[PDB]
Amino acid sequence: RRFGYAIVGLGKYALNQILPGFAGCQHSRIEALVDGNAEKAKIVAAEYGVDPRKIYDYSNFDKIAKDPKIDAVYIILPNSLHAEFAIRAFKAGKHVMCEKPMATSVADCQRMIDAAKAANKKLMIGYRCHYDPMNRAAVKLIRENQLGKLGMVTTDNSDVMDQNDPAQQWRLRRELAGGGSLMDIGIYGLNGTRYLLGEEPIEVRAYTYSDPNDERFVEVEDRIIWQMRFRSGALSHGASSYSTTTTSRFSVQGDKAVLLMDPATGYYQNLISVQTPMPANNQFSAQLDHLAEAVINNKPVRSPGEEGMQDVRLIQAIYEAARTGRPVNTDWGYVRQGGY
Amino acid sequence: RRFGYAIVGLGKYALNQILPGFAGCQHSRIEALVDGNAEKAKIVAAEYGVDPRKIYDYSNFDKIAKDPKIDAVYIILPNSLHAEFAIRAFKAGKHVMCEKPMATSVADCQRMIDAAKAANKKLMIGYRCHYDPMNRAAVKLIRENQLGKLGMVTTDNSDVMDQNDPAQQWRLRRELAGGGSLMDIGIYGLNGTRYLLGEEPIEVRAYTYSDPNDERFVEVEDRIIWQMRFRSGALSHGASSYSTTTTSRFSVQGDKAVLLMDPATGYYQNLISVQTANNQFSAQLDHLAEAVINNKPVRSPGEEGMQDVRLIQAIYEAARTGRPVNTDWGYVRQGGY
Ligand SMILES: NC(=O)c1ccc[n+]([C@@H]2O[C@H](COP(=O)([O-])OP(=O)(O)OC[C@H]3O[C@@H](n4cnc5c(N)ncnc54)[C@H](O)[C@@H]3O)[C@@H](O)[C@H]2O)c1
Ligand SMILES: NC(=O)c1ccc[n+]([C@@H]2O[C@H](COP(=O)([O-])OP(=O)(O)OC[C@H]3O[C@@H](n4cnc5c(N)ncnc54)[C@H](O)[C@@H]3O)[C@@H](O)[C@H]2O)c1
């Protein structure tokens, strides 16, 4: 490995999925850690074999600029802190890997891209599904016209949000989160509908409801259903939920056949099947090594901040629709650089 | 088989699913046939062993009143003709088995129930899913609280509608159909959401879209998506499609687990699974029989068929207006789901 990563935020996703993910990389390596807790970091640094000399925090973060071995930083902090460290990261002349959602604002999304252009460094959002062989296979068979003309997409993404003092979970603060289940996980359905169909929604409608007596959803929504229409005439209906167990299910209906992905966006072995009348590339690794190679070849990354912005913007539209009860035009010429 | 059935409409569903369905019954029997074609009726009567002496048509239909071995009639004609023969059937003092949708109007749905009460005969709608062991099993495990508190239901029901001169498919003609994919098959999703959740939607929202250049959907809709909310706070989002292949898929999300029915409402072996012996057709036929043989109300009454029709109307209204539609009108499924 010759591409150094600086992991910012040693939380659940970092510790459980990302750090272990490095094991399969073939270019990436954990060069430095960052966290508001040295004790934790220490144990971590040891654990993954990183010299404790590279354990920073949110104060001396900018210090990374003086370490050329640190090719890039990987933000894995609450959504609101995304833009802050993304820019500071670019200011230190380093490529950025930012987790989804890109940010809690469309503005910050644009700002981040700016900073990136400035520092002349790459900005990649954590859409691991864009590096999951299973999803890529689904996409392949759809493009090979095995479903025929696509007409109805259906998505659902849910998981029970811990009730343990909602004041604790940053996902339940509109400030740190930016939204409820949609921002957190529905985004997988939204994002998937787009790359599965290979096009953008031109119109959007939605509705949301959260129990008024549930302490968890005082700031962020629990359940929200959205419906979209595309230029090709394809349609979709999806939802995200914070009060029902694990659900990761996508269905794509064509005139020839129907595709079923269940689980669709899970951490381990996703399943896809077709109804007609992962060789050395787990998502995590492939995601990390994808930013590396992009740099090592000046080639554009598959999941740019422009894509992360498109989702955030759509997510706003969807929330707007749910708020007004009216459809919302989203036909603003966005275009997937590189494809889906 | 002491219950005599008079099959009205020897079409695809009658010939392919219903007639053969009798083979498994244990009370029902094919006593008479009815159809605007005695030639076929003949071949059919022979085929299933019915004396050609009982082959009627839409003119001498009422004649059935003079045959006491004829306990009931089974309407299997286009949706618009449902109410007409349902009432005439009751007028001849005979229990009625009417296929879904009950009718193309809420009024006719009420009228049919009236006629039924009058003739003091029973009225049962063809919701075979209410007699499918697989569905009943799904319902059982939900009631046993294996999913926990229900929060998100998802349904999809689709099948490609033949393009062969749409002036040929009574389903593509508003008057005979009453609606598009919703009336025809979405109804399974709507109906299933209700008996799976064991409650009624109090609010409804929907949207529909059909290609303006497709000859098929000039009168009836191709695809329509509807979202509903229930009293328990549960939610649902479903759709029906006339332009995409076979899809019969239901998912029910609880806080404990998730139920997946796929296929959910098929003719043969449906599948259900949870993530943390008999057959609908026969059981449906024998269900009307026994109900009579015991002065016991049937599980799928015309009141239930009306509720769906009324809901479908509110869903079409919503799709038309683009605003939510209140459906909290106190309906109640006597007996249960
Ligand atoms: N792509 C995926 O599969 C996936 C899955 C899980 C999480 N995520 C994303 O990664 C990010 C982190 O999620 P997570 O589950 O690891 O969260 P977490 O709460 O477990 O981790 C948060 C990290 O940021 C730090 N932090 C900084 N300020 C904080 C504050 N104000 N309050 C609480 N935490 C604070 C914590 O110390 C910790 O290191 C989010 O943007 C989330 O949406 C993506
Ligand atoms: N529960 C189920 O599984 C299921 C499945 C299929 C059909 N159905 C229902 O059963 C009924 C019949 O459907 P089908 O597929 O058998 O239809 P079909 O067109 O194959 O059969 C229609 C029958 O009614 C007669 N008919 C009377 N007037 C007609 C007219 N004006 N034009 C065309 N047909 C006319 C035909 O001769 C034929 O015997 C419908 O109400 C349908 O919704 C239910």
Side-chain angles (χ1 to χ4, degrees), chain A residues 3-25 27-38 41 43-52 54-62 64-65 67-164 166-167 169-172 175-297 299-315 317-325 327-336 338-340, chain B residues 2-25 27-39 41 43-52 54-62 64-65 67-68 70-164 166-172 175-294 296-322 324-337:
Chain A
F3 193 83
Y5 268 107
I7 282 55
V8 183
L10 304 184
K12 200 181 176 187
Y13 189 51
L15 302 186
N16 290 173
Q17 327 304 326
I18 307 306
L19 289 173
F22 276 102
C25 292
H27 299 300
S28 311
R29 56 184 201 253
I30 307 177
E31 188 62 72
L33 302 185
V34 187
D35 189 60
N37 184 304
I43 312 186
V44 176
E47 190 166 296
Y48 292 79
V50 185
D51 58 310
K54 304 199 171 190
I55 294 184
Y56 309 44
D57 55 61
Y58 312 131
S59 299
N60 56 183
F61 172 61
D62 309 70
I64 67 171
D67 192 324
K69 267 188 191 169
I70 298 185
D71 285 289
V73 52
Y74 194 141
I75 303 70
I76 300 180
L77 312 165
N79 312 327
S80 48
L81 298 309
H82 288 193
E84 196 193 308
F85 294 68
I87 299 180
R88 288 170 53 174
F90 285 126
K91 288 184 174 178
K94 301 180 179 301
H95 302 88
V96 175
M97 181 73 95
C98 189
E99 254 314 308
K100 31 108 303 198
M102 182 161 200
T104 61
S105 165
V106 190
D108 297 61
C109 287
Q110 184 52 279
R111 190 177 314 181
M112 292 183 271
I113 304 177
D114 289 330
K117 288 180 168 178
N120 183 54
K121 294 295 195 167
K122 294 168 179 301
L123 182 53
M124 186 194 193
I125 313 300
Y127 288 116
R128 52 177 176 80
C129 282
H130 296 185
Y131 308 94
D132 174 27
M134 290 303 82
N135 275 70
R136 300 314 300 176
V139 171
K140 179 186 168 58
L141 63 83
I142 295 182
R143 295 293 113 78
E144 307 192 317
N145 192 69
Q146 284 193 54
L147 265 41
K149 186 181 179 181
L150 315 180
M152 187 66 80
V153 179
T154 316
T155 73
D156 282 305
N157 292 84
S158 319
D159 236 329
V160 174
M161 167 56 62
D162 219 310
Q163 207 292 292
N164 72 307
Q169 265 295 175
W170 66 263
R171 284 186 176 78
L172 309 197
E175 301 305 304
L176 293 310
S181 60
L182 179 48
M183 278 295 276
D184 188 53
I185 49 179
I187 182 171
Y188 285 92
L190 171 56
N191 195 77
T193 298
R194 301 173 50 240
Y195 67 70
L196 276 173
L197 282 184
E199 56 182 306
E200 301 298 315
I202 63 179
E203 188 183 62
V204 158
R205 294 180 179 70
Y207 167 76
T208 178
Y209 173 81
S210 322
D211 178 358
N213 299 310
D214 190 326
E215 319 172 64
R216 302 177 288 178
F217 322 110
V218 182
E219 295 174 53
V220 306
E221 86 282 340
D222 159 34
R223 285 162 295 156
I224 183 173
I225 301 173
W226 63 94
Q227 171 281 145
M228 312 183 285
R229 197 181 71 211
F230 299 69
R231 191 75 66 190
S232 63
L235 294 170
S236 67
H237 65 109
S240 58
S241 170
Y242 261 157
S243 38
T244 45
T245 36
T246 314
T247 308
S248 183
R249 181 181 291 118
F250 297 165
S251 79
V252 191
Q253 294 165 45
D255 56 22
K256 287 177 60 184
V258 179
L259 164 69
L260 177 67
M261 299 168 79
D262 184 21
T265 77
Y267 292 156
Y268 342 94
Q269 198 52 77
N270 282 314
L271 295 292
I272 67 172
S273 55
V274 175
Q275 300 98 66
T276 81
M278 339 122 289
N281 195 69
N282 85 77
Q283 49 188 159
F284 304 111
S285 295
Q287 186 188 303
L288 297 171
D289 277 357
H290 186 266
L291 173 53
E293 292 157 49
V295 175
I296 298 178
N297 308 310
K299 295 313 187 307
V301 75
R302 184 182 299 166
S303 315
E306 286 76 297
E307 164 83 326
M309 187 181 56
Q310 170 64 342
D311 271 351
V312 170
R313 200 176 177 190
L314 289 176
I315 298 176
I318 289 177
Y319 281 144
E320 196 185 321
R323 174 173 49 255
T324 75
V328 169
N329 189 315
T330 60
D331 189 8
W332 49 58
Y334 170 78
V335 54
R336 256 285 230 183
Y340 291 89
Chain B
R2 72 127 293 194
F3 207 81
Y5 268 107
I7 282 55
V8 183
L10 304 184
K12 200 180 176 187
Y13 189 51
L15 302 186
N16 290 173
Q17 328 304 326
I18 307 307
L19 289 173
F22 275 102
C25 292
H27 299 300
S28 311
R29 56 167 155 104
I30 307 177
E31 188 61 72
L33 302 185
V34 188
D35 189 60
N37 184 304
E39 189 159 359
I43 312 185
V44 176
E47 190 166 296
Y48 292 79
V50 185
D51 58 310
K54 304 198 172 190
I55 294 184
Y56 308 44
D57 55 61
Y58 312 131
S59 299
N60 56 183
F61 173 61
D62 309 70
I64 67 171
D67 192 324
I70 286 196
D71 285 290
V73 53
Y74 194 141
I75 304 70
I76 301 180
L77 312 166
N79 312 327
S80 48
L81 298 309
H82 288 194
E84 195 193 308
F85 294 68
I87 299 181
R88 288 171 53 175
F90 285 126
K91 288 184 173 178
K94 301 179 178 301
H95 301 89
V96 175
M97 181 72 96
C98 189
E99 254 313 309
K100 31 108 304 198
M102 182 162 200
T104 61
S105 165
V106 189
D108 297 61
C109 286
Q110 184 52 279
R111 190 177 315 180
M112 291 183 271
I113 304 177
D114 289 330
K117 288 180 168 178
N120 181 65
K121 288 294 176 173
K122 296 172 182 300
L123 183 53
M124 186 194 192
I125 313 300
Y127 288 116
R128 53 178 175 80
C129 281
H130 296 184
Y131 308 94
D132 173 28
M134 290 302 83
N135 276 70
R136 300 314 300 176
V139 171
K140 179 185 169 58
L141 64 83
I142 294 181
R143 295 293 114 78
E144 308 192 317
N145 192 70
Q146 285 193 54
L147 264 43
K149 186 182 179 182
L150 314 181
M152 187 66 81
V153 178
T154 316
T155 74
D156 283 305
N157 292 84
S158 320
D159 236 329
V160 174
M161 167 55 63
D162 219 310
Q163 206 292 292
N164 72 307
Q168 294 196 52
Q169 245 297 177
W170 67 263
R171 284 185 176 79
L172 294 164
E175 302 304 304
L176 293 310
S181 59
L182 180 47
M183 278 295 276
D184 188 53
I185 49 180
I187 182 171
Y188 286 91
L190 170 56
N191 194 77
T193 299
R194 300 173 50 241
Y195 67 70
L196 276 173
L197 281 184
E199 56 182 306
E200 301 299 315
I202 63 179
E203 188 183 62
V204 159
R205 295 180 178 69
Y207 167 75
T208 178
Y209 173 82
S210 321
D211 178 358
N213 300 310
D214 190 326
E215 319 172 64
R216 302 178 288 178
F217 322 111
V218 182
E219 295 174 53
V220 306
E221 85 283 339
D222 159 34
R223 286 162 295 155
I224 183 174
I225 301 173
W226 62 94
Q227 171 281 144
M228 312 184 285
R229 198 180 71 211
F230 299 69
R231 191 75 66 190
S232 64
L235 294 170
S236 66
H237 66 109
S240 57
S241 170
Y242 261 157
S243 38
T244 46
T245 37
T246 315
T247 308
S248 184
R249 181 180 291 118
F250 297 164
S251 79
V252 190
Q253 294 166 45
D255 56 22
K256 287 177 60 184
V258 178
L259 165 68
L260 177 67
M261 299 168 80
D262 183 21
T265 77
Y267 291 156
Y268 342 95
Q269 198 53 77
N270 282 315
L271 295 292
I272 67 172
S273 54
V274 175
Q275 299 98 65
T276 57
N278 220 297
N279 89 76
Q280 49 189 159
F281 305 112
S282 295
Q284 187 187 302
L285 297 171
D286 277 357
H287 186 267
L288 173 53
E290 293 156 48
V292 175
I293 298 178
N294 308 310
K296 273 295 220 305
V298 75
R299 184 182 299 167
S300 315
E303 286 76 297
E304 164 83 326
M306 188 181 56
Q307 170 64 343
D308 271 351
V309 170
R310 199 176 177 190
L311 288 175
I312 286 134
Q313 211 188 190
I315 288 177
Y316 281 143
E317 196 186 321
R320 174 173 50 255
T321 75
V325 171
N326 189 315
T327 59
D328 189 8
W329 49 58
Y331 170 78
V332 53
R333 252 262 261 192
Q334 295 303 298
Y337 291 88

